[PDB]
Short mmCIF file of C-alpha atoms and ligand atoms in Angstrom, two decimals:
data_model
loop_
_atom_site.label_atom_id
_atom_site.label_comp_id
_atom_site.label_asym_id
_atom_site.label_seq_id
_atom_site.Cartn_x
_atom_site.Cartn_y
_atom_site.Cartn_z
CA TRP A 1 5.37 -46.83 -22.35
CA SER A 2 1.93 -48.35 -22.00
CA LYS A 3 -0.61 -46.67 -19.76
CA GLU A 4 1.08 -47.14 -16.40
CA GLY A 5 4.47 -45.64 -17.32
CA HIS A 6 2.81 -42.53 -18.79
CA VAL A 7 0.49 -42.10 -15.78
CA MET A 8 3.40 -42.30 -13.38
CA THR A 9 5.65 -40.04 -15.49
CA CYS A 10 2.94 -37.38 -15.68
CA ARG A 11 1.93 -37.53 -11.99
CA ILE A 12 5.59 -37.18 -10.95
CA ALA A 13 5.85 -34.23 -13.31
CA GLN A 14 2.60 -32.58 -12.18
CA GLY A 15 3.73 -32.67 -8.50
CA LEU A 16 6.93 -30.82 -9.35
CA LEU A 17 5.50 -27.91 -11.35
CA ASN A 18 5.97 -24.32 -10.25
CA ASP A 19 3.03 -21.92 -9.85
CA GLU A 20 2.89 -20.59 -13.39
CA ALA A 21 3.27 -24.14 -14.90
CA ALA A 22 0.66 -25.62 -12.60
CA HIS A 23 -1.77 -22.89 -13.51
CA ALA A 24 -1.19 -23.17 -17.29
CA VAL A 25 -1.53 -26.93 -17.18
CA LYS A 26 -4.82 -26.48 -15.29
CA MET A 27 -6.20 -23.95 -17.82
CA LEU A 28 -5.27 -26.28 -20.76
CA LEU A 29 -6.92 -29.47 -19.48
CA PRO A 30 -10.59 -30.36 -20.02
CA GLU A 31 -12.87 -30.16 -17.00
CA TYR A 32 -13.63 -33.89 -16.92
CA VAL A 33 -10.12 -34.85 -15.65
CA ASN A 34 -10.41 -32.60 -12.61
CA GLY A 35 -6.98 -31.01 -13.10
CA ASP A 36 -5.16 -34.35 -13.48
CA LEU A 37 -2.63 -34.35 -16.37
CA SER A 38 -1.98 -38.06 -15.86
CA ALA A 39 -5.58 -38.89 -16.80
CA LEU A 40 -4.87 -37.72 -20.38
CA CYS A 41 -1.16 -38.64 -20.90
CA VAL A 42 -2.23 -41.77 -22.73
CA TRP A 43 -4.21 -39.72 -25.26
CA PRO A 44 -1.49 -39.78 -27.90
CA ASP A 45 -1.53 -43.61 -27.90
CA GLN A 46 -5.30 -43.48 -28.56
CA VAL A 47 -5.21 -40.99 -31.40
CA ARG A 48 -2.15 -42.33 -33.19
CA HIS A 49 -4.60 -44.78 -34.85
CA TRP A 50 -6.86 -42.02 -36.18
CA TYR A 51 -6.65 -41.05 -39.79
CA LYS A 52 -6.31 -37.38 -39.02
CA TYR A 53 -3.35 -38.06 -36.65
CA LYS A 54 -1.44 -40.50 -38.88
CA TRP A 55 1.39 -38.02 -38.95
CA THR A 56 1.87 -38.78 -35.20
CA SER A 57 2.74 -42.45 -35.50
CA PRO A 58 6.46 -42.04 -36.17
CA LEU A 59 6.71 -39.52 -33.33
CA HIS A 60 6.57 -42.13 -30.51
CA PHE A 61 10.00 -43.69 -31.13
CA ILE A 62 13.37 -43.54 -32.84
CA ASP A 63 14.72 -46.26 -35.15
CA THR A 64 18.51 -46.55 -34.66
CA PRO A 65 20.71 -48.86 -36.85
CA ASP A 66 20.72 -52.56 -36.06
CA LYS A 67 23.44 -53.52 -33.58
CA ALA A 68 25.13 -50.06 -33.71
CA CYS A 69 23.94 -49.01 -30.23
CA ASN A 70 24.08 -45.29 -30.90
CA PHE A 71 21.87 -42.39 -31.85
CA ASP A 72 22.55 -39.48 -34.20
CA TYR A 73 19.78 -36.98 -34.76
CA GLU A 74 20.45 -36.26 -38.45
CA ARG A 75 20.88 -39.91 -39.37
CA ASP A 76 18.04 -41.41 -37.30
CA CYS A 77 15.33 -38.81 -36.64
CA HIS A 78 13.16 -39.16 -39.69
CA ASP A 79 10.14 -41.28 -40.59
CA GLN A 80 10.32 -44.29 -42.99
CA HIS A 81 10.00 -42.06 -46.07
CA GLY A 82 12.90 -39.83 -45.03
CA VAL A 83 10.92 -36.86 -43.70
CA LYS A 84 13.19 -35.13 -41.13
CA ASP A 85 12.38 -34.51 -37.44
CA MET A 86 9.67 -37.15 -37.50
CA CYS A 87 10.76 -39.01 -34.39
CA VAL A 88 10.21 -38.66 -30.62
CA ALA A 89 13.24 -36.30 -30.25
CA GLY A 90 11.95 -34.04 -32.99
CA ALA A 91 8.44 -34.11 -31.54
CA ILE A 92 9.66 -33.01 -28.07
CA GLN A 93 11.37 -30.04 -29.68
CA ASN A 94 8.28 -29.21 -31.76
CA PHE A 95 5.79 -29.20 -28.93
CA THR A 96 8.15 -27.50 -26.48
CA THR A 97 8.57 -24.67 -29.03
CA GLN A 98 4.79 -24.56 -29.52
CA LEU A 99 4.12 -24.27 -25.76
CA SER A 100 6.70 -21.48 -25.46
CA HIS A 101 4.25 -19.29 -27.47
CA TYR A 102 1.47 -19.86 -24.88
CA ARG A 103 2.67 -17.05 -22.56
CA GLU A 104 2.67 -14.36 -25.29
CA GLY A 105 -0.41 -15.78 -27.09
CA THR A 106 -0.70 -17.10 -30.63
CA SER A 107 -2.69 -15.78 -33.58
CA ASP A 108 -2.43 -19.19 -35.28
CA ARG A 109 -5.67 -21.12 -35.56
CA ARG A 110 -3.91 -24.33 -36.08
CA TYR A 111 -1.54 -24.47 -32.98
CA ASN A 112 -3.55 -26.32 -30.29
CA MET A 113 -1.91 -25.95 -26.85
CA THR A 114 -3.90 -28.67 -25.17
CA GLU A 115 -2.56 -31.12 -27.78
CA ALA A 116 0.95 -29.67 -27.49
CA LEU A 117 0.85 -30.28 -23.74
CA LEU A 118 -0.45 -33.87 -24.05
CA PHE A 119 1.96 -34.77 -26.88
CA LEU A 120 4.92 -33.21 -25.05
CA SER A 121 4.01 -34.97 -21.81
CA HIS A 122 3.53 -38.32 -23.51
CA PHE A 123 6.64 -38.09 -25.73
CA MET A 124 8.84 -37.14 -22.76
CA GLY A 125 7.77 -40.50 -21.40
CA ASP A 126 8.37 -42.31 -24.67
CA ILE A 127 11.92 -40.97 -25.20
CA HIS A 128 12.79 -42.35 -21.74
CA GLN A 129 11.47 -45.88 -22.52
CA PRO A 130 14.66 -47.61 -23.71
CA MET A 131 12.94 -49.84 -26.29
CA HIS A 132 11.42 -46.71 -27.88
CA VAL A 133 14.97 -45.95 -29.03
CA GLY A 134 15.98 -49.49 -30.19
CA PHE A 135 16.92 -51.18 -33.47
CA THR A 136 15.14 -50.61 -36.75
CA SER A 137 14.67 -54.18 -38.10
CA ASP A 138 13.09 -55.52 -34.90
CA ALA A 139 10.95 -52.35 -34.30
CA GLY A 140 12.45 -51.64 -30.88
CA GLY A 141 11.89 -55.23 -29.88
CA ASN A 142 8.25 -55.42 -31.07
CA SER A 143 9.25 -58.18 -33.51
CA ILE A 144 11.00 -60.21 -30.84
CA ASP A 145 8.39 -62.73 -29.63
CA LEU A 146 9.01 -64.39 -26.31
CA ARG A 147 7.32 -65.31 -23.11
CA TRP A 148 7.18 -63.36 -19.92
CA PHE A 149 6.79 -65.82 -17.04
CA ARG A 150 3.85 -68.01 -18.16
CA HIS A 151 2.22 -65.81 -20.84
CA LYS A 152 3.30 -64.81 -24.36
CA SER A 153 4.75 -61.33 -25.02
CA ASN A 154 7.42 -59.38 -26.91
CA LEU A 155 10.56 -57.60 -25.78
CA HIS A 156 9.14 -54.09 -26.44
CA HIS A 157 6.09 -54.92 -24.33
CA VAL A 158 8.19 -56.24 -21.52
CA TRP A 159 9.63 -52.73 -21.15
CA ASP A 160 6.41 -50.81 -22.05
CA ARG A 161 4.35 -52.72 -19.48
CA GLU A 162 5.27 -56.24 -18.17
CA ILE A 163 8.01 -55.23 -15.77
CA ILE A 164 5.77 -52.52 -14.43
CA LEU A 165 2.73 -54.88 -14.10
CA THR A 166 4.80 -57.63 -12.40
CA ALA A 167 6.34 -55.19 -9.92
CA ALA A 168 2.94 -53.70 -9.09
CA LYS A 169 1.48 -57.21 -8.58
CA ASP A 170 4.35 -58.73 -6.55
CA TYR A 171 4.99 -55.73 -4.22
CA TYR A 172 1.97 -53.36 -4.34
CA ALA A 173 -1.16 -55.51 -4.87
CA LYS A 174 -1.51 -54.18 -8.43
CA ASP A 175 -1.59 -50.61 -7.00
CA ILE A 176 0.20 -48.21 -9.37
CA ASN A 177 -0.38 -45.07 -7.26
CA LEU A 178 1.68 -46.62 -4.44
CA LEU A 179 4.48 -47.86 -6.69
CA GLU A 180 4.64 -44.25 -7.95
CA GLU A 181 4.98 -42.98 -4.39
CA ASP A 182 8.02 -45.24 -3.80
CA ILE A 183 9.55 -43.92 -7.05
CA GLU A 184 8.85 -40.40 -5.79
CA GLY A 185 10.30 -41.51 -2.47
CA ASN A 186 13.49 -42.84 -4.06
CA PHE A 187 14.41 -39.36 -5.51
CA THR A 188 13.12 -37.16 -2.67
CA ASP A 189 15.08 -39.00 0.09
CA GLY A 190 16.35 -42.31 -1.41
CA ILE A 191 19.06 -43.60 -3.80
CA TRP A 192 18.33 -41.01 -6.56
CA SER A 193 18.28 -37.97 -4.26
CA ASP A 194 22.00 -37.56 -5.05
CA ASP A 195 21.51 -37.48 -8.85
CA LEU A 196 18.66 -34.99 -9.12
CA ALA A 197 20.49 -31.81 -10.16
CA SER A 198 22.30 -33.91 -12.75
CA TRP A 199 19.02 -35.11 -14.35
CA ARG A 200 17.88 -31.47 -14.63
CA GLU A 201 21.06 -30.03 -16.23
CA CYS A 202 21.05 -31.10 -19.94
CA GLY A 203 21.35 -27.79 -21.87
CA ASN A 204 18.87 -26.38 -24.35
CA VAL A 205 16.02 -28.59 -25.64
CA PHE A 206 18.01 -30.17 -28.51
CA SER A 207 20.77 -31.01 -26.08
CA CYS A 208 18.31 -32.60 -23.66
CA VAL A 209 16.54 -34.80 -26.26
CA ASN A 210 19.94 -35.90 -27.62
CA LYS A 211 20.97 -36.86 -24.09
CA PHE A 212 17.71 -38.66 -23.29
CA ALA A 213 17.71 -40.66 -26.52
CA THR A 214 21.38 -41.62 -26.08
CA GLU A 215 20.68 -42.87 -22.59
CA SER A 216 17.77 -44.87 -23.98
CA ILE A 217 19.62 -46.66 -26.80
CA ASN A 218 22.46 -47.39 -24.38
CA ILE A 219 20.04 -49.01 -21.92
CA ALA A 220 18.30 -50.86 -24.78
CA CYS A 221 21.68 -52.44 -25.60
CA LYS A 222 23.12 -52.93 -22.14
CA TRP A 223 19.90 -54.14 -20.45
CA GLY A 224 17.09 -54.64 -22.99
CA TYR A 225 18.35 -56.77 -25.89
CA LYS A 226 21.17 -58.12 -23.66
CA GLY A 227 20.71 -61.84 -22.97
CA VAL A 228 17.44 -62.10 -24.86
CA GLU A 229 16.69 -64.71 -27.50
CA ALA A 230 13.44 -64.85 -29.46
CA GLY A 231 11.07 -67.67 -28.47
CA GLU A 232 12.54 -68.05 -24.96
CA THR A 233 11.15 -67.34 -21.48
CA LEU A 234 12.24 -64.46 -19.26
CA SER A 235 11.45 -64.63 -15.56
CA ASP A 236 12.79 -63.76 -12.12
CA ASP A 237 16.38 -63.12 -13.31
CA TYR A 238 15.56 -60.59 -16.03
CA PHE A 239 12.73 -59.14 -13.98
CA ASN A 240 14.81 -58.60 -10.82
CA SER A 241 17.82 -57.15 -12.58
CA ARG A 242 15.90 -54.84 -15.05
CA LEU A 243 13.19 -53.54 -12.62
CA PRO A 244 15.44 -50.85 -11.13
CA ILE A 245 16.40 -49.62 -14.60
CA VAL A 246 12.72 -49.32 -15.57
CA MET A 247 11.92 -47.49 -12.34
CA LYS A 248 14.66 -44.93 -12.84
CA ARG A 249 13.50 -44.09 -16.40
CA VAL A 250 9.97 -43.50 -15.11
CA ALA A 251 11.40 -41.16 -12.54
CA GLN A 252 13.74 -39.46 -14.91
CA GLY A 253 11.04 -38.76 -17.50
CA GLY A 254 8.81 -37.23 -14.87
CA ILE A 255 11.50 -35.06 -13.36
CA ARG A 256 12.64 -33.86 -16.79
CA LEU A 257 9.09 -33.24 -17.99
CA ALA A 258 8.49 -30.94 -15.00
CA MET A 259 11.72 -29.11 -15.71
CA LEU A 260 10.72 -28.52 -19.33
CA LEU A 261 7.21 -27.35 -18.45
CA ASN A 262 8.58 -25.10 -15.64
CA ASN A 263 10.92 -23.52 -18.22
CA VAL A 264 8.38 -23.02 -21.00
CA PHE A 265 5.58 -21.64 -18.87
CA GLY A 266 7.81 -19.67 -16.44
CA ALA A 267 9.71 -16.38 -16.77
C1 LIG B 1 -7.63 -28.69 -29.04
O1 LIG B 1 -7.46 -30.10 -28.97
C2 LIG B 1 -8.24 -30.80 -28.02
C3 LIG B 1 -7.93 -32.29 -28.08
O2 LIG B 1 -7.77 -32.69 -29.43
C4 LIG B 1 -9.75 -30.56 -28.26
O3 LIG B 1 -10.31 -31.04 -27.07
C5 LIG B 1 -11.24 -32.10 -27.32
O4 LIG B 1 -12.51 -31.56 -27.64
C6 LIG B 1 -13.54 -32.51 -27.80
C7 LIG B 1 -14.79 -31.74 -28.23
O5 LIG B 1 -14.66 -31.50 -29.60
C8 LIG B 1 -13.78 -33.25 -26.49
O6 LIG B 1 -14.76 -34.22 -26.74
C9 LIG B 1 -15.89 -34.09 -25.88
O7 LIG B 1 -15.71 -34.75 -24.63
C10 LIG B 1 -16.80 -34.52 -23.72
C11 LIG B 1 -16.48 -35.10 -22.35
O8 LIG B 1 -16.07 -36.46 -22.57
C12 LIG B 1 -15.70 -37.17 -21.37
O9 LIG B 1 -16.80 -37.65 -20.62
C13 LIG B 1 -17.64 -38.56 -21.31
C14 LIG B 1 -18.77 -38.97 -20.40
O10 LIG B 1 -19.76 -37.97 -20.51
C15 LIG B 1 -16.87 -39.77 -21.82
O11 LIG B 1 -17.74 -40.59 -22.58
C16 LIG B 1 -15.72 -39.28 -22.67
O12 LIG B 1 -14.94 -40.34 -23.17
C17 LIG B 1 -14.87 -38.36 -21.81
O13 LIG B 1 -14.47 -39.08 -20.67
C18 LIG B 1 -18.06 -35.13 -24.32
O14 LIG B 1 -19.17 -34.84 -23.45
C19 LIG B 1 -18.35 -34.60 -25.73
O15 LIG B 1 -19.39 -35.35 -26.39
C20 LIG B 1 -17.10 -34.64 -26.62
O16 LIG B 1 -16.84 -35.96 -27.09
C21 LIG B 1 -12.51 -33.92 -26.00
O17 LIG B 1 -12.61 -34.34 -24.65
C22 LIG B 1 -11.34 -32.94 -26.05
N1 LIG B 1 -10.16 -33.70 -25.76
C23 LIG B 1 -9.26 -33.28 -24.86
C24 LIG B 1 -8.06 -34.17 -24.61
O18 LIG B 1 -9.38 -32.22 -24.26
C25 LIG B 1 -10.01 -29.07 -28.24
O19 LIG B 1 -11.36 -28.75 -28.53
C26 LIG B 1 -9.12 -28.37 -29.24
N2 LIG B 1 -9.32 -26.93 -29.11
C27 LIG B 1 -9.71 -26.18 -30.16
C28 LIG B 1 -9.87 -24.69 -29.91
O20 LIG B 1 -9.91 -26.66 -31.28
C1 LIG B 2 4.79 -30.39 -35.09
O1 LIG B 2 3.46 -30.29 -34.66
C2 LIG B 2 2.58 -30.01 -35.74
C3 LIG B 2 1.14 -29.97 -35.19
O2 LIG B 2 0.98 -28.76 -34.46
C4 LIG B 2 2.72 -31.06 -36.85
O3 LIG B 2 2.04 -30.51 -37.94
C5 LIG B 2 1.44 -31.45 -38.83
O4 LIG B 2 2.38 -32.05 -39.69
C6 LIG B 2 1.77 -33.14 -40.37
C7 LIG B 2 2.82 -34.06 -40.96
O5 LIG B 2 3.59 -33.38 -41.88
C8 LIG B 2 0.77 -32.53 -41.37
O6 LIG B 2 0.20 -33.55 -42.15
C9 LIG B 2 -0.44 -33.08 -43.36
O7 LIG B 2 -1.83 -32.81 -43.16
C10 LIG B 2 -2.40 -32.06 -44.23
C11 LIG B 2 -3.82 -31.63 -43.85
O8 LIG B 2 -3.96 -30.19 -43.88
C12 LIG B 2 -2.36 -32.89 -45.53
O9 LIG B 2 -2.15 -31.98 -46.62
C13 LIG B 2 -1.28 -33.99 -45.62
O10 LIG B 2 -1.94 -35.25 -45.88
C14 LIG B 2 -0.31 -34.15 -44.43
O11 LIG B 2 -0.51 -35.44 -43.82
C15 LIG B 2 -0.32 -31.80 -40.59
O12 LIG B 2 -1.24 -31.10 -41.39
C16 LIG B 2 0.35 -30.78 -39.67
N1 LIG B 2 -0.61 -30.21 -38.75
C17 LIG B 2 -0.53 -28.92 -38.40
C18 LIG B 2 -1.54 -28.49 -37.41
O13 LIG B 2 0.32 -28.10 -38.82
C19 LIG B 2 4.17 -31.40 -37.20
O14 LIG B 2 4.27 -32.58 -37.96
C20 LIG B 2 4.94 -31.67 -35.91
N2 LIG B 2 6.33 -32.08 -36.21
C21 LIG B 2 7.08 -32.85 -35.40
C22 LIG B 2 8.50 -33.17 -35.81
O15 LIG B 2 6.65 -33.24 -34.30
C1 LIG B 3 13.43 -47.93 -4.38
O1 LIG B 3 14.78 -48.26 -4.03
C2 LIG B 3 14.97 -49.29 -3.06
C3 LIG B 3 16.44 -49.35 -2.67
O2 LIG B 3 16.75 -48.19 -1.94
C4 LIG B 3 14.46 -50.63 -3.60
O3 LIG B 3 14.59 -51.65 -2.60
C5 LIG B 3 14.88 -52.96 -3.16
O4 LIG B 3 13.71 -53.56 -3.67
C6 LIG B 3 13.90 -54.83 -4.25
C7 LIG B 3 12.63 -55.27 -4.97
O5 LIG B 3 11.92 -54.13 -5.39
C8 LIG B 3 14.30 -55.81 -3.14
O6 LIG B 3 14.39 -57.12 -3.68
C9 LIG B 3 13.51 -58.08 -3.04
O7 LIG B 3 14.06 -58.52 -1.80
C10 LIG B 3 13.51 -59.70 -1.20
C11 LIG B 3 14.32 -60.02 0.06
O8 LIG B 3 13.74 -59.37 1.19
C12 LIG B 3 13.53 -60.85 -2.21
O9 LIG B 3 13.06 -62.09 -1.64
C13 LIG B 3 12.63 -60.44 -3.37
O10 LIG B 3 12.43 -61.55 -4.27
C14 LIG B 3 13.26 -59.22 -4.04
O11 LIG B 3 14.50 -59.57 -4.66
C15 LIG B 3 15.63 -55.31 -2.56
O12 LIG B 3 16.02 -56.12 -1.47
C16 LIG B 3 15.51 -53.86 -2.09
N1 LIG B 3 16.81 -53.34 -1.67
C17 LIG B 3 17.03 -52.78 -0.48
C18 LIG B 3 18.43 -52.29 -0.21
O13 LIG B 3 16.17 -52.65 0.40
C19 LIG B 3 13.00 -50.43 -4.04
O14 LIG B 3 12.51 -51.56 -4.72
C20 LIG B 3 12.89 -49.24 -5.00
N2 LIG B 3 11.50 -49.26 -5.46
C21 LIG B 3 11.04 -48.44 -6.38
C22 LIG B 3 9.60 -48.64 -6.72
O15 LIG B 3 11.72 -47.56 -6.92
CL1 CL B 4 -10.05 -36.18 -27.91
ZN1 ZN B 5 4.49 -44.87 -24.38
ZN1 ZN B 6 5.99 -48.72 -26.82
ZN1 ZN B 7 3.61 -43.35 -27.17
#
């Protein structure tokens, strides 16, 4: 996601933490964000451009084979030079395992728990963005130029940001905090309140990232790439039909992030 999807995913997650998770998250954050995880959940998108964090660039996404519409960890979760685990599913495992040493303490200089928290929180968002688990040759739709209503865009960006920005504008006066409340509403009492226990039961961490990534490639095929031709204009049709899919993935990432953090920081 771009900034808004991450902010919403992290705020949903922060509001669902248990007491030990809430406290750990508070101890790990810098004072300037006043306890707000969502104010830093974009940080991995900032530092992926830094020379010292070049290793992080492949960790935001998964390249799956063109037109195959499936994910397999061994085949797909590796960077462009074949180094294993270097994808968003591998990263979620890595930082979850790192945070599980926080309770007992670590005598390793190099494990930074603030960064583990921010990477984990961000990547839990990314694995839920369907076009972050799209085809290899089009870079998850980044190479598919198009137009979104009047202005120029690309298919990846439509899912990272445009659908969210158009929904916020048309129904919430550009107000993301209120959009987020309706998402929160839709799983506390609304249409997703039925599915909640389901979202939370995905096995161990490998099992959950496999599940999340599979859901994402399947949405990328069924809803993302579906109907789209390069150079053309997408508008009310694509926007109205895809919006609810985008909203659910925001919600799902948040809910599942909270579950992970509750497990790693809890008993
Ligand atoms: C573990 O990793 C953490 C993240 O990589 C490290 O935390 C980072 O530590 C640096 C200090 O080395 C902080 O940078 C400082 O930020 C403060 C506050 O900045 C904010 O406010 C100013 C306005 O005054 C604004 O301009 C900034 O953009 C911020 O909004 C500055 O006053 C300092 O000059 C300095 O730049 C980072 O904030 C901090 N990042 C995070 C995400 O916490 C941490 O040190 C590492 N821990 C260990 C033990 O190595
Ligand atoms: C799991 O998280 C750790 C960070 O806690 C990642 O460790 C980092 O792995 C990268 C990529 O292999 C290492 O890059 C190397 O940096 C050294 C500098 O000492 C340099 O010799 C090389 O140029 C190379 O780029 C990086 O040092 C290393 N950092 C730490 C703190 O261990 C790891 O990649 C993560 N894995 C996944 C799947 O998320
Ligand atoms: C949370 O879920 C509810 C359903 O329980 C969503 O309500 C639906 O919202 C869409 C647009 O967001 C409505 O479509 C709009 O309807 C008007 C007609 O009044 C039309 O002119 C607009 O162009 C647009 O198509 C839809 O009717 C509505 N469905 C129901 C049953 O009320 C809500 O959007 C969800 N929001 C979030 C943020 O999760
Ligand atoms: Cl920083
Ligand atoms: Zn993102
Ligand atoms: Zn993206
Ligand atoms: Zn990202």
